Amino acid sequence: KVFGRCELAAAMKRHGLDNYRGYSLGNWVCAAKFESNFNTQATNRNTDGSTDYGILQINSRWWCNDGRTPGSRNLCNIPCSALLSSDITASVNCAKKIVSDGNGMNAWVAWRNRCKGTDVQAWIRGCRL
């Protein structure tokens, strides 16, 4: 599923992400735009052989099982394929664990480089929430 901007914002707010660990909703929408272009089916292979999955590009080296990243962990206890669903519940729940792990949203490279320090409220401007 390719989300609209305000549609995704409402779903994330309906999933508890607004101000989660201090990150306003616009941070999460900005991250999803530049990680996946709001596409739940996005995948990208990394040099080390791990793969990133879904609307927030969660990496199989630590967070999910895809059967093809030897020596990796599955800290969200899910198959990586579950992160590609049109229902974003599994991605949101796993993102809550990532952002709690000490490094905040710096875990998402595109957030650090394209969202951090910008007017992220602009990403939810005009949405009914």
Binding residues for Na ion, rule: CB under 5 A, are 60, 65, 69, 72, 74
- From Cl ion, Na ion, none, interface partner of 85 (C-beta below 5 to 8 A by class): none
Q: Which does 57 bind (CB under 5 to 8 A by kind): Na ion, Cl ion, none?
A: none
Report the residue number whose CB is nearest to Na ion: 72
Q: Least CB distance from residue 81 to Na ion, whole Å?
A: 12
Task: Name which of Na ion, Cl ion, none residue 121 binds, using a CB cut-off of 5 to 8 Å depending on partner kind.
Answer: Cl ion
Gap sites in the chain (C to N > 2.5 Å), preceding residue numbers? none
Q: Which residue is nearest to Cl ion (CB)?
A: 26
Catalytic residue among 35, 66, 87, 119: 35
- Residue 35 is a catalytic residue: yes
Q: Is there a catalytic annotation at residue 66?
A: no
DSSP states of the chain? -B--HHHHHHHHHTTT-TTBTTB-HHHHHHHHHHHHTTBTT-EEE-TTS-EEETTTTEETTTS-B-S-STT---TT-SBGGGGGSSSTHHHHHHHHHHHTTTTGGGGSHHHHHHTTTS-GGGGGTT---
Q: Which residues are annotated as a binding site for substrate?
A: 101
Point out which residues bind Cl ion (CB under 5 A): 24-26, 104, 121
Q: What positions carry a catalytic annotation?
A: 35, 52
